[PDB]
Structure 1
Amino acid sequence: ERGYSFSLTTFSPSGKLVQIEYALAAVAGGAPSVGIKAANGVVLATEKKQKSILYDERSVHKVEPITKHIGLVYSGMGPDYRVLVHRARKLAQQYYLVYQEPIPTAQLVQRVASVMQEYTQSGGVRPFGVSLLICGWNEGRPYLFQSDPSGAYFAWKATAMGKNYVNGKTFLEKRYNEDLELEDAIHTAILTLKESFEGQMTEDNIEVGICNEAGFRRLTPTEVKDYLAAIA
């Protein structure tokens, strides 16, 4: 068939794009997630509760690698996340087939956010319902970026997205400083996800990925139980 070819996102008489405002409400009703960079690498952490004991928790993953050195989490709705992951997987490849170099983390956010802006203006589509947190260690210095369904992006030291994010950002303000190691950042990222979790935080209720100068990787549930031990 064909499409619609008209924007269903218009300006209000008060001058506010209403569908982008409603899409942020879907982001705020998502699972909580925190992300902290500290002086040698970035820690991404999320919160993954299965609805019942029947689910296989080792089947899908929130924390996803994009390349050797770039990871990515979200806080929003599920199926919209897997679309722009596969889009971001490809955009790192057309950069590499031209320049023969891994893409910088700043240039990836230039191109993922330009998709979402192009997607909130074109005809016959509703915008995405996810926000992102993107980490990576390009040229020594680590990076931590956050996009939104509107298409903007920022450069955070530490932030929180999802439910109770206004309580998470006040908690990080009284805890984070400029001088921490990576494993110190892990202990304060589980401590801030404990502010809104359920009663038991086991080795499969959360999912943590880290960056180093050695590259991005995702923690296996063995040592996640070790970090969850000696906590609070």
Structure 2
Amino acid sequence: RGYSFSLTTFSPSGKLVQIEYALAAVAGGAPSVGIKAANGVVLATEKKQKSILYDERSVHKVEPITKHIGLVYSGMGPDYRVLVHRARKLAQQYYLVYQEPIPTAQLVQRVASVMQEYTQSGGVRPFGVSLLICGWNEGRPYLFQSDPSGAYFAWKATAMGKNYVNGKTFLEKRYNEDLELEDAIHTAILTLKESFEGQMTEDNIEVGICNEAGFRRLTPTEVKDYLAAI
């Protein structure tokens, strides 16, 4: 049982062939924006299903890691769910040994640590989910993104998934360092509104904020509320 040989390896050019394919599988994923704001963040994403047939209260893409840290993805479906499982477990190891909710930076350390050995270690392919992190952690909010390589960077705004160059350029245009509450939600909504493939339905987007009282998903009556206030 098992293989115990790495399938991720170095090209003759000198680069990882599987990781750039993982960033291709991320770049073919659903678009998701994340905006660091002066008191709190907003992590919006786009839930377009096949038909109007499914339960849009069944699966989530905003979902917390146990205290005040939500994380949203773009790319492969269930590999995300594995990273939520591992991330909740690592946050609870940290909580049972140090008796505080985990600093966001350390959670990104350990999630980027567990995503690294799937670029090695016996036949496993890398995850191909570049999920991004939020978190209030004391004083000022944080935001990160763990690539399927294992790198991570903190910033003020980003996008990912489909056509993310337009998201990074557009958020580079419209960002202010004091831009703080629901205005961030506003520009997040008009970053997903940029493509969306049509009509901007409230059941096809969900956002999550970290407004100094724990990460919480937004109820579907609140997104449609600001979709009435467009």
- TM-score, normalised via structure 2 length: 0.98
Residues 146 and 156, structure 1, Cα contact 8 Å, conserved in 2: no
Deviations 1:34-53 (A, max 9, x none): 00011000100000112112
Q: Deviations for 1:56-105, whole angstroms, at most 9, x for unmatched residues?
A: 11111111110221000000110111001000011011101111111000
Higher strand share: 1
CA distance in 1, matches of 2:19, 2:139: 36
C-alpha separation between the residues in 1 aligned to 2:62 and 2:97?
28
Q: Structure 2: how far apart are the matches of 1:33 and 1:168?
A: 9
> Match of 2:73, SS?
strand
1:198 CA displacement: 2.0
Aligned-residue offset at 1:110: 0.3
Distance 1:61 1:31 in 2: 13
1:101-159 CA distance string (max 9 Å, x none): 11000000000000011111111111101001100101120001011000010001100
8 A Cα contact 1:37 1:43, kept in partner: yes
Between the aligned partners of 1:95 and 1:173, the Cα distance in structure 2 is 35
Q: Deviations over 1:173-215 (max 9, x none)?
A: 1101101122110001001111111221121010000001111
Distance 1:105 1:69 in 2: 9
Gaps of 5+ in 2: none
Mapped to 1, the partners of 2:180 and 2:9 lie a distance apart of 46
Q: Counterpart of 1:93 in 2: which secondary structure?
A: helix
SS in 2 for 1:88: helix
Q: More displaced, 4-13 or 143-152?
A: 4-13
How many Å separate the matches in 2 of 1:98 and 1:211? 24
Q: Does 1:26 align with 2:25?
A: yes
Whole-angstrom CA distance in 2 between matches of 1:54 and 1:217? 26
Match of 1:223 in 2: 222
Question: Whole-Å Cα distance in 2 between the matches of residues 220 and 46 of structure 1?
Answer: 14
Contact 1:96 1:102 (8 Å CA) reproduced: yes
Runs of 4+ in 1 over 6 A off after TM superposition: none
Q: What is the rounded CA distance, in whole Å, between the counterparts of 1:63 and 1:151 in structure 2?
A: 21
Counterpart CA distance in 2 for 1:84 and 1:92 is 12
Aligned to 1:34, the other structure's residue is in SS state: strand
Identity %: 100
How many Å separate the matches in 2 of 1:179 and 1:89? 31
Distance 2:106 2:78 in 1: 25
* Distance in 1 separating the partners of 2:12 and 2:197: 42
Whether contact under 8 Å (1:132, 1:147) holds in the other structure is: yes
Any residues of structure 2 matched to 1:112-127 within 5 Å, and which? 112-127=111-126
Deviation at 1:230, TM superposition (A): 2.1
Matches of 2:204 and 2:52 in 1, distance apart?
A: 12
